[PDB]
Design a protein around this ligand. Structure first.
Ligand SMILES: Nc1nc2c(ncn2[C@@H]2O[C@H](COP(=O)(O)OP(=O)(O)OP(=O)(O)O)[C@@H](O)[C@H]2O)c(=O)[nH]1
Lengths: 422, 422
């Protein structure tokens, strides 16, 4: 029980998740090339089903483009069994409205039939995890309808999303500010939690911490994969805090509608054995809570935290953890309404590339910087009816996108006001 | 034989069970799986049931809405003892919420739980009472323990019910909603327990850290301390004791003013990691340890506040001439409120434990419990006033008037305890 079904939607979704699945297989002693057990450790059953001696990741692979799901057989192969691979028609793209309304009645039903199959095979659902782009086409459009549909069918099952916000440094497809809000609105309405990652921050991390002169899309995915792997780890490899997805919602989300979380991890490694010596708890905690490793274009030291959760993976002494975290409490302000809310935990199993790694999640009022930038881009295009009829013939009305903005603005305003004092 | 049924509810009730029952097994010469060895000593019937031939059965029920505490206890920690027929297993977590075990999920198990309880009751000619061991502040325990207790007392009203309430520490697996679950559940204990003992894991933590052993702390040390406390508290019910031969007598000796039934306890020796080497304790020292601050497993100092009742239950050879002269050293510390003209009761029972020449515990009905309550109540109010995390309970059925009522009953309880000091 407390098992997790993972839904991967769109290109970004499938590549990030694919990298995730390879790392999680390594940690649990599963050879990703074919699912065979090597020496299996940890709570393998939370993410993999088991038939015979094969571990089968409980993934649903979704796209609209035939090629994107079909070609997973070449990039990851046997890692994702074909019964989970769903696509149709001729594909669709670069428009939220198209992904959301023109995916095909049959296409969505197939996705849901697969989701239900993964669910019925599971003793008890502890939640759903989705990986998707917040922009583009399929990841935001079809992915948001998928999010909506799942909650309607399973009203009490928490849903966590890892979602990637776009950046003009990477994509010229500037229709994006429209897509960004329509999906943000649905995340606000239907997810229990979401991890806000974006490529502006990931890009600058790649340039300054991984020392990459001109980060490729694959370097961004490398950092993302590390975040997902180490964040997810608190749920699956022992630990002193006994977490689950339902428990994370309880601990990190004090209010509904304010469930957007930042994530930060360190050390980062550029896809090779660059790791060295051992970091102390102090330098590692300092990196994690610094602004430089935040995987969202925020500057969290200037804000206030509603809640935070810090996991130490590896052989770290209790007394060093506590001194390092005391330093963090002194330096980074927290909202005193919650006399608790800063939970520190450790797990004895280290990540494959280091002696000790640290993961932090949290609710920081500066998370809205992402949303505020999106709003601004949107306003410049929207006040001019930049692209009214495109969206008009794909089934959305101006009132619906206005509803989407109103909700987004409400969330921004609530974060700024909620944490103004305490 | 006047017998007691023990119910283990939620994570700590069940994680403790293997240490508690292993200790009892050794005390009585039961060889862990129920096999008789040597000769039975003590009133074994009070805690173990008879197999048709030889074997002894712990008279227990294990209740956990999530399957994990029970599965490791019965498959890894103590085999062929906690018979699966008496385990009540759910397949979902509580997301740490009080509400889940009291209103929305745990309630569907009450038919099963009360049916199993009656089956235990029906095997015994003379019940003395019930003991419910549970974590307070952790939804499954915080919720079901009082739900179960209330269901029992309306069916068996003449029995004494005692609870062992364990408050989670902040360096262990606490939830950010601990203050809510804690007073939401104290509110029900206050109306259903006849005797309720509160043991604070933060004091266990502090004492061990003070000793210089914080880096050795793990669940196993906490479980050993908690299990020993249960064994020693319960010990006078297992032999021909002169102080408390029955839970019925405990009620009389410990709670003269029925609403104020919350007790604080102390122990000596404490055995961190079982490496303490308490080779010799003299009788005079044992009493000084029991009064001293660093052996009280609660955040109180005996030098402050007032007593309403105080029972010193020692084990092993403790000549009464020493006990009576030693007690005079408490003249400047142990002060009873002049509403109840009592005295410190002290006497001893035997040990079957070959490692300690002597040991003992105290049970205190002392106003300092009010400070544990006030700490939690202050946190409750601070969070409650900003609705932090309250949405999660409201959606499970906890109409908000419930939170207001809990606040009022605990503020009133605190006031009544402090009033004894004026
Ligand atoms: N960080 C990161 N961003 C990506 C990755 N792949 C795509 N993106 C970004 O996400 C946006 C693209 O959205 P996609 O999901 O590719 O679009 P789609 O859902 O595949 O369907 P189309 O719109 O038809 O491509 C652009 O900003 C991409 O730069 C990736 O691997 N990592």
């Amino acid at each position: 029980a407390g098992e997790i079904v993972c839904i991967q939607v769109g290109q970004a979704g499938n590549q990030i998740a694919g990298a995730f699945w390879q790392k999680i297989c390594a940690e649990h002693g599963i050879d990703p090339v074919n699912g065979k057990a090597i020496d299996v450790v940890g709570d393998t059953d939370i993410f993999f089903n088991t038939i015979g001696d094969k571990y089968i990741p409980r993934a649903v692979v979704v796209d609209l483009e035939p090629a994107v799901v079909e070609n997973i057989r070449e990039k990851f192969g046997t890692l994702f069994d074909p019964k989970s691979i769903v696509s149709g028609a001729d594909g669709a793209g670069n428009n939220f409205a198209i992904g959301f309304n023109e995916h095909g009645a049959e296409t969505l039903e197939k996705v849901m039939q697969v989701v239900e199959q993964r669910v019925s095979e599971t003793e008890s659902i502890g939640g759903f995890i989705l990986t998707h782009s917040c922009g583009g086409g399929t990841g935001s459009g079809f992915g948001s309808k998928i999010l909506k549909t799942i909650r309607e069918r399973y009203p009490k099952v928490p849903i966590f999303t890892f979602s990637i916000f776009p950046s003009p440094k990477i994509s010229e497809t500037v229709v994006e500010p429209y897509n960004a809000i329509m999906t943000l609105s649905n995340l606000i309405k239907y997810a229990s939690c979401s991890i806000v990652l974006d490529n502006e921050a990931l890009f600058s991390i790649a340039e300054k911490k991984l020392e990459v002169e001109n980060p490729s899309l694959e370097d961004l995915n490398l950092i993302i994969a590390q975040v997902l792997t180490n964040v997810t780890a608190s749920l699956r490899f022992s630990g002193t805090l006994n977490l689950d997805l339902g428990k994370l919602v309880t601990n990190l989300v004090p209010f509904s509608n304010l469930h957007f979380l930042m994530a930060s991890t360190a050390p980062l490694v550029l896809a090779g054995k660059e790791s060295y010596e051992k970091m102390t708890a102090k330098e590692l905690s300092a990196q994690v809570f610094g602004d430089e490793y935040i995987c969202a274009a925020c500057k969290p030291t200037t804000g206030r935290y509603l809640a935070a959760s810090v996991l130490f993976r590896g052989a770290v002494k209790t007394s060093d953890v506590n001194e390092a975290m005391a330093t963090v409490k002194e330096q980074n302000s927290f909202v005193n309404w919650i006399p608790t809310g800063f939970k520190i935990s450790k797990s004895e199993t280290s990540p494959k590339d280091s002696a000790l790694g640290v993961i932090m999640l949290g609710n920081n009022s500066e998370i809205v910087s992402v949303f505020e930038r999106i709003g601004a881009n949107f306003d410049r295009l929207w006040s001019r009816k930049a692209f009214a009829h495109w969206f008009t013939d794909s089934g959305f009305e101006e009132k619906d996108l206005d509803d989407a903005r109103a909700l987004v603005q409400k969330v921004i305003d609530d974060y700024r006001k909620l944490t103004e004092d305490a | 034989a006047r017998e007691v049924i023990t119910i283990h509810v939620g994570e700590l009730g069940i994680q403790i069970a293997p240490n508690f029952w292993k200790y009892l097994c050794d005390e009585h010469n039961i060889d862990y799986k129920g096999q008789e060895k040597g000769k039975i000593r003590g009133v074994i019937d009070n805690f173990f049931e008879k197999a048709s031939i030889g074997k002894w059965i712990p008279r227990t029920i294990l209740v956990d809405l999530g399957p994990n505490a029970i599965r490791k206890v019965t498959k890894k920690d103590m085999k062929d003892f906690f018979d699966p027929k008496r385990c009540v297993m759910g397949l979902a977590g509580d997301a740490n919420l009080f509400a889940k075990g009291y209103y929305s999920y745990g309630t569907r198990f009450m038919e099963e739980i009360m049916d199993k309880i009656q089956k235990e009751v029906d095997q015994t000619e003379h019940l003395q009472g019930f003991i419910v061991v549970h974590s307070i502040g952790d939804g499954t325990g915080a919720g079901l323990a009082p739900l179960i207790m209330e269901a029992i007392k309306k069916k068996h009203p003449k029995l004494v019910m005692m609870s062992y309430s364990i408050v989670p520490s902040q360096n262990m697996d606490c939830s950010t909603i601990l203050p809510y679950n804690a007073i939401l559940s104290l509110d029900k204990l206050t109306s259903c327990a006849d005797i309720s003992m509160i043991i604070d894991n933060d004091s266990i933590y502090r004492i061990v850290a003070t000793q210089g052993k914080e880096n050795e702390l793990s669940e196993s040390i906490f479980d050993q301390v908690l299990a020993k406390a249960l064994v020693e508290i319960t010990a006078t019910l297992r032999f021909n004791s002169p102080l408390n031969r029955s839970m019925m007598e405990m009620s009389t000796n410990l709670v003269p003013f029925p609403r104020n039934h919350f007790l604080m306890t102390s122990m000596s020796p404490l055995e961190t990691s079982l490496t303490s080497a308490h080779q010799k304790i003299e009788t005079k020292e044992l009493m000084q340890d029991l009064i001293d601050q660093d052996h009280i497993l609660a955040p109180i100092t005996v030098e402050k506040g007032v007593f309403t009742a105080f029972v010193i239950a020692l084990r092993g050879e403790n000549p009464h001439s020493i006990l009576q002269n030693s007690i005079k050293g408490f003249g400047d510390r142990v002060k009873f409120s002049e509403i109840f003209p009592t005295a410190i009761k002290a006497d001893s029972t035997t040990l079957t434990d070959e490692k300690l020449a002597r040991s003992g515990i105290t049970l205190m009905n002392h106003s300092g419990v009010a400070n544990l309550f006030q700490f939690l109540l202050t946190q409750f109010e601070l969070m409650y006033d900003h609705d932090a995390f309250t949405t999660w309970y409201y959606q499970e059925g906890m109409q908000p008037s419930e939170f207001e009522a809990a606040k009022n009953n605990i503020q009133k309880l605190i006031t009544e305890y402090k009033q004894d000091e004026y």
